[PDB]
Structure 1
Amino acid sequence: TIQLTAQRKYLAEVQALETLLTRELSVFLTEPGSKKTNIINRITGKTYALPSTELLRLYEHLEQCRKQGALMYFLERQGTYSGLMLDYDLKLNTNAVPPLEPPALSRLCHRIFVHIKNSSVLIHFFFTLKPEVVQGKYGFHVLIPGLKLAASTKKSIIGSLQHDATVQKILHEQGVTNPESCLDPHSASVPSLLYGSSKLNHKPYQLKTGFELVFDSSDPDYIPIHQIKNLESYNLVSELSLTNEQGSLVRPVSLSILMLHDPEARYLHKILNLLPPEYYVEYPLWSNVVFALANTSANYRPLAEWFSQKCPEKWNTGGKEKLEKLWNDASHHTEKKITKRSIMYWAHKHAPQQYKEIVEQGYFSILAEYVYSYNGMLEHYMIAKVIYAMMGNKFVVDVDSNGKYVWFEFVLPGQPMNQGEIWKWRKEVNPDELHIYISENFSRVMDRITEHIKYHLSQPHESNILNYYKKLLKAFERSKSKIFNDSFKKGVIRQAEFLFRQRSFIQTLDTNPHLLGVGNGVLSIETIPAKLINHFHEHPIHQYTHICYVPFNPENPWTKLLLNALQDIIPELDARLWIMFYLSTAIFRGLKEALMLLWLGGGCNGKTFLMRLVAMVLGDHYASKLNISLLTSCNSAFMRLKGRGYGYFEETNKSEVLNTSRLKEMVNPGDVTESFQMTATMVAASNYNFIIDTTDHGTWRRLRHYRSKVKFCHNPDPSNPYEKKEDPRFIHEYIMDPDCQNAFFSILVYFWEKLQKEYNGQIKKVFCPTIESETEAYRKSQDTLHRFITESEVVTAYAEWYNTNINVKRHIALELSQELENSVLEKYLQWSPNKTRILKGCRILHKFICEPKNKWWEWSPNPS
Structure 2
Amino acid sequence: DTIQLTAQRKYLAEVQALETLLARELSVFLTEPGSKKTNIINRITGKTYALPSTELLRFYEHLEQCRKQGALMYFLERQGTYSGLMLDYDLKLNTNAPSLESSVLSRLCHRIFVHIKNSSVLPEGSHKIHFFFTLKPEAVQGKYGFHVLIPGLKMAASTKKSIIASLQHDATVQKILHEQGVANPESCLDPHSASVPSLLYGSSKLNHRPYQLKTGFELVFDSSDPDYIPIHQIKNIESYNLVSELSLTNEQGSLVRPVYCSLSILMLHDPEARYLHKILNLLPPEYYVEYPLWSNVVFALANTSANYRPLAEWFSQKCPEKWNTGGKEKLEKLWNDASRKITKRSIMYWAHKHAPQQYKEIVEQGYFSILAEYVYSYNGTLEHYMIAKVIYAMMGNKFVVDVDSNGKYVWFEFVLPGQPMNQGEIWKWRKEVNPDELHIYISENFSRVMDRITEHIKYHLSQPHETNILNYYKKLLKAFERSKSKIFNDSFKKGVIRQAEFLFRQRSFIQTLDTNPYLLGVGNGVLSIETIPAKLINHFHEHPIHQYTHICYEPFNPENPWTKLLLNALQDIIPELDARLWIMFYLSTIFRGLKEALMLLWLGGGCNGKTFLMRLVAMVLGDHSAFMRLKGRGYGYFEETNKSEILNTSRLKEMVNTATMVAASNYNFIIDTTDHGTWRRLRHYRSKVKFCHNPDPNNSYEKKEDPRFIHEYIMDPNCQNAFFSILVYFWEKLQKEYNGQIKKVFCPTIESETEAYRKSQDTLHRFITERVVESPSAETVYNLSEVVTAYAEWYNANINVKRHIALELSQELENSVLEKYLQWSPNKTRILKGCRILHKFETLQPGESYIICEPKNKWWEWSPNP
TM normalised by structure 1 equals: 0.89
Answer whether contact 1:655 1:688 (CA < 8 A) is retained.
no
User: CA offset at residue 638 of structure 1?
Assistant: 2.1
| Residue 106 to residue 763, structure 1, CA distance change in 2 (3 Å) | same
Answer whether contact 1:852 1:860 (CA < 8 A) is retained.
no
State the secondary structure of the residue aligned to 2:362.
helix
CA distance in 2, matches of 1:409, 1:659: 43
| Residue 689 to residue 120, structure 1, CA distance change in 2 (3 Å) | same
Greater Cα offset, 153-162 or 842-851: 842-851
- In the alignment, what sits opposite 2:789? 796
CA distance in 2, matches of 1:570, 1:164: 105
User: CA offset at residue 91 of structure 1?
Assistant: 2.5
Answer whether contact 1:131 1:138 (CA < 8 A) is retained.
no
CA distance in 2, matches of 1:835, 1:236: 109
State the secondary structure of the residue aligned to 1:145.
strand
State the secondary structure of the residue aligned to 2:812.
helix
Answer whether contact 2:645 2:670 (CA < 8 A) is retained.
yes
Greater Cα offset, 248-257 or 683-692: 683-692
Greater Cα offset, 686-695 or 534-543: 686-695
Partner deviation per Cα, 1:438-493 (whole Å, 9 max, x = no partner): 01211122112112211221222211111111111111121122112111111111
Unaligned runs of 5+ in 2: 123-128, 769-784, 842-851
The answer to whether the aligner puts 1:766 opposite 2:774 as a matched pair is no
User: CA offset at residue 824 of structure 1?
Assistant: 14
State the secondary structure of the residue aligned to 1:68.
coil
State the secondary structure of the residue aligned to 1:109.
helix
| Residue 195 to residue 399, structure 1, CA distance change in 2 (3 Å) | same
User: CA offset at residue 575 of structure 1?
Assistant: 1.1
The answer to whether the aligner puts 1:278 opposite 2:286 as a matched pair is yes
Answer whether contact 1:830 1:838 (CA < 8 A) is retained.
yes
Greater Cα offset, 829-838 or 58-67: 829-838
- In the alignment, what sits opposite 2:604? 601
- In the alignment, what sits opposite 2:336? 328
Answer whether contact 1:291 1:330 (CA < 8 A) is retained.
yes
Greater Cα offset, 83-92 or 839-848: 839-848
User: CA offset at residue 720 of structure 1?
Assistant: 2.0
User: CA offset at residue 810 of structure 1?
Assistant: 13
| Residue 283 to residue 651, structure 1, CA distance change in 2 (3 Å) | same
State the secondary structure of the residue aligned to 2:31.
coil
User: CA offset at residue 833 of structure 1?
Assistant: 21
Task: Please point out which of 441, 452, 455 is paired with 1:451.
Answer: 455
User: CA offset at residue 663 of structure 1?
Assistant: 5.7
User: CA offset at residue 725 of structure 1?
Assistant: 4.7
Answer whether contact 2:577 2:856 (CA < 8 A) is retained.
no
CA distance in 2, matches of 1:473, 1:272: 36
Answer whether contact 1:83 1:150 (CA < 8 A) is retained.
no
CA distance in 2, matches of 1:80, 1:211: 25
User: CA offset at residue 591 of structure 1?
Assistant: 1.8
State the secondary structure of the residue aligned to 1:619.
coil
CA distance in 2, matches of 1:166, 1:833: 123
Answer whether contact 2:674 2:764 (CA < 8 A) is retained.
no
State the secondary structure of the residue aligned to 2:637.
strand
CA distance in 1, matches of 2:287, 2:174: 51
Partner deviation per Cα, 1:240-289 (whole Å, 9 max, x = no partner): 11221111111011343223213212211111112322333311112211
Greater Cα offset, 57-66 or 814-823: 814-823
State the secondary structure of the residue aligned to 1:37.
coil
Answer whether contact 2:576 2:855 (CA < 8 A) is retained.
no
Task: Please point out which of 436, 439, 453 is paired with 2:440.
Answer: 436
| Residue 525 to residue 842, structure 1, CA distance change in 2 (3 Å) | closer
CA distance in 2, matches of 1:197, 1:840: 101
| Residue 204 to residue 811, structure 1, CA distance change in 2 (3 Å) | farther
User: CA offset at residue 783 of structure 1?
Assistant: 3.0
User: CA offset at residue 151 of structure 1?
Assistant: 2.8
CA distance in 2, matches of 1:50, 1:829: 95
RMSD of equivalent CA atoms: 4.1
Answer whether contact 2:636 2:662 (CA < 8 A) is retained.
yes
Greater Cα offset, 27-36 or 711-720: 711-720
Answer whether contact 1:589 1:680 (CA < 8 A) is retained.
yes
Answer whether contact 2:525 2:538 (CA < 8 A) is retained.
yes
CA distance in 1, matches of 2:659, 2:646: 23
Greater Cα offset, 265-274 or 597-606: 597-606
| Residue 276 to residue 687, structure 1, CA distance change in 2 (3 Å) | same
User: CA offset at residue 801 of structure 1?
Assistant: 12
TM normalised by structure 2 equals: 0.89
User: CA offset at residue 381 of structure 1?
Assistant: 0.7
User: CA offset at residue 375 of structure 1?
Assistant: 1.1
| Residue 821 to residue 218, structure 1, CA distance change in 2 (3 Å) | closer
- In the alignment, what sits opposite 1:293? 301
User: CA offset at residue 574 of structure 1?
Assistant: 1.2
Partner deviation per Cα, 1:773-818 (whole Å, 9 max, x = no partner): 22222333323258689xx999999999999999999998742355
Greater Cα offset, 642-651 or 540-549: 642-651
Partner deviation per Cα, 1:38-60 (whole Å, 9 max, x = no partner): 11111111111111111000111
| Residue 807 to residue 311, structure 1, CA distance change in 2 (3 Å) | farther
User: CA offset at residue 611 of structure 1?
Assistant: 1.9
Greater Cα offset, 172-181 or 247-256: 172-181
User: CA offset at residue 301 of structure 1?
Assistant: 0.9
Partner deviation per Cα, 1:207-248 (whole Å, 9 max, x = no partner): 012111011122334211111111012111111112211111
| Residue 180 to residue 341, structure 1, CA distance change in 2 (3 Å) | farther
Matched residues, percent identical?
A: 97
CA distance in 2, matches of 1:830, 1:199: 93
User: CA offset at residue 153 of structure 1?
Assistant: 1.1
Answer whether contact 2:604 2:687 (CA < 8 A) is retained.
yes
- In the alignment, what sits opposite 2:245? 239
Answer whether contact 2:675 2:812 (CA < 8 A) is retained.
no
Greater Cα offset, 654-663 or 320-329: 654-663
| Residue 220 to residue 825, structure 1, CA distance change in 2 (3 Å) | closer
User: CA offset at residue 204 of structure 1?
Assistant: 0.7
| Residue 832 to residue 139, structure 1, CA distance change in 2 (3 Å) | closer
User: CA offset at residue 652 of structure 1?
Assistant: 2.2
Answer whether contact 2:794 2:840 (CA < 8 A) is retained.
no
- In the alignment, what sits opposite 1:628? none
User: CA offset at residue 180 of structure 1?
Assistant: 3.4
| Residue 834 to residue 189, structure 1, CA distance change in 2 (3 Å) | closer
Answer whether contact 2:88 2:148 (CA < 8 A) is retained.
yes
- In the alignment, what sits opposite 1:816? 809
State the secondary structure of the residue aligned to 2:294.
helix
CA distance in 2, matches of 1:282, 1:210: 60
Partner deviation per Cα, 1:611-652 (whole Å, 9 max, x = no partner): 21111111134xxxxxxxxxxxxxx22212212110211232
| Residue 829 to residue 522, structure 1, CA distance change in 2 (3 Å) | closer
- In the alignment, what sits opposite 1:674? none
Partner deviation per Cα, 1:667-725 (whole Å, 9 max, x = no partner): 34xxxxxxxxxx22221121222245555454433232223233445664452222335
Greater Cα offset, 489-498 or 314-323: 314-323
- In the alignment, what sits opposite 1:656? 645
Answer whether contact 2:676 2:816 (CA < 8 A) is retained.
no
| Residue 570 to residue 76, structure 1, CA distance change in 2 (3 Å) | same
Answer whether contact 2:41 2:75 (CA < 8 A) is retained.
yes
Partner deviation per Cα, 1:34-88 (whole Å, 9 max, x = no partner): 1201111111111111111110001111111111221111111113421101212
Greater Cα offset, 110-119 or 265-274: 110-119
CA distance in 2, matches of 1:158, 1:665: 98
| Residue 808 to residue 418, structure 1, CA distance change in 2 (3 Å) | farther
Partner deviation per Cα, 1:77-123 (whole Å, 9 max, x = no partner): 11342110121222222223x22222222222222222222344440
| Residue 495 to residue 821, structure 1, CA distance change in 2 (3 Å) | closer
| Residue 847 to residue 277, structure 1, CA distance change in 2 (3 Å) | closer
Answer whether contact 1:40 1:75 (CA < 8 A) is retained.
yes
Q: May I ask how many residue pairs the two structures share in their alignment?
A: 831
User: CA offset at residue 729 of structure 1?
Assistant: 3.3
| Residue 826 to residue 468, structure 1, CA distance change in 2 (3 Å) | closer
Answer whether contact 1:602 1:688 (CA < 8 A) is retained.
yes
CA distance in 2, matches of 1:358, 1:299: 23
| Residue 812 to residue 463, structure 1, CA distance change in 2 (3 Å) | farther
Greater Cα offset, 844-853 or 530-539: 844-853
Answer whether contact 2:131 2:148 (CA < 8 A) is retained.
yes
Answer whether contact 2:553 2:721 (CA < 8 A) is retained.
yes
- In the alignment, what sits opposite 2:146? 140
- In the alignment, what sits opposite 1:545? 549
| Residue 666 to residue 842, structure 1, CA distance change in 2 (3 Å) | closer
User: CA offset at residue 364 of structure 1?
Assistant: 0.9
Answer whether contact 2:157 2:194 (CA < 8 A) is retained.
no
Greater Cα offset, 502-511 or 767-776: 767-776
User: CA offset at residue 580 of structure 1?
Assistant: 0.8
